[PDB]
Design a protein around this ligand. Structure first.
Ligand SMILES: CCCCCCCC/C=C\CCCCCCCC(=O)O[C@H](COC(=O)CCCCCCC/C=C/CCCCCCCC)COP(=O)(O)OCCN
Lengths: 83, 71
């Protein structure tokens, strides 16, 4: 509570480069775990269609699978265009 | 009967001559410089965030064009 303050003052007076490096590295470690945009980044990476989407053979009881790309079923990227 | 003429200082004296070191401050404070730097960094981060999200959308559109043309 009082030792750490004096140590930080001495470090800022003597080695500001090391203090800045440790602060920036600590922020780089901590901040991603507390951000709601990390999930959005994962979703954006998952939304990129690198390969062809192979169609499924219609067996007759897949309601959620679309029959046309413009059909309402399937994943939606509406959350992305508003981001 | 000519009077004496010689190289002499002017009556009274010469004007004062400065010799002390003159190094002014001529600067801001550290807090101000750090604040401007961090503000510039934040503005740049915001701009690049918007631009990269738009770039992701454009790449998705290009990939969809390729997918439509693949068969
Ligand atoms: C938590 C995340 C950490 C990981 C991320 C770090 C990223 C990269 C930074 C580390 C790189 C390696 C650094 C090497 C360590 C140096 C050790 C050392 O020997 O330093 C001494 C000096 O002693 C010191 O270590 C410097 C003081 C203590 C280290 C710096 C401060 C510690 C952390 C401060 C920041 C923490 C968060 C900021 C607080 C914000 C305020 C609330 C060198 O002095 P001399 O070479 O002998 O000088 C000869 C000429 N006179």
């Amino acid at each position: 509570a009082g030792r750490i303050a004096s140590f930080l003052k001495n470090a800022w007076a003597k080695e500001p480069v090391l203090v800045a490096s440790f602060a920036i590295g600590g922020l780089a470690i901590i901040l991603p775990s507390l951000s709601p945009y990390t999930n959005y980044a994962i979703r954006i990476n998952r939304a990129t269609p690198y390969n062809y989407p192979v169609p499924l053979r219609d067996d007759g009881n897949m309601p959620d699978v679309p029959s046309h790309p413009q059909d309402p079923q399937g994943p939606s990227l509406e959350w992305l265009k508003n981001l | 009967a000519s009077k004496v003429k010689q190289d002499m200082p002017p009556p009274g004296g010469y004007g004062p001559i400065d010799y002390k070191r003159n190094l002014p401050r001529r600067g801001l404070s550290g807090y101000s410089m750090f604040a401007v730097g961090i503000g510039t960094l934040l503005f740049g981060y915001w701009s690049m965030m918007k631009w990269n999200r738009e770039r992701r959308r454009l790449q998705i559109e290009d990939f969809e064009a390729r997918i439509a043309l693949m068969p």
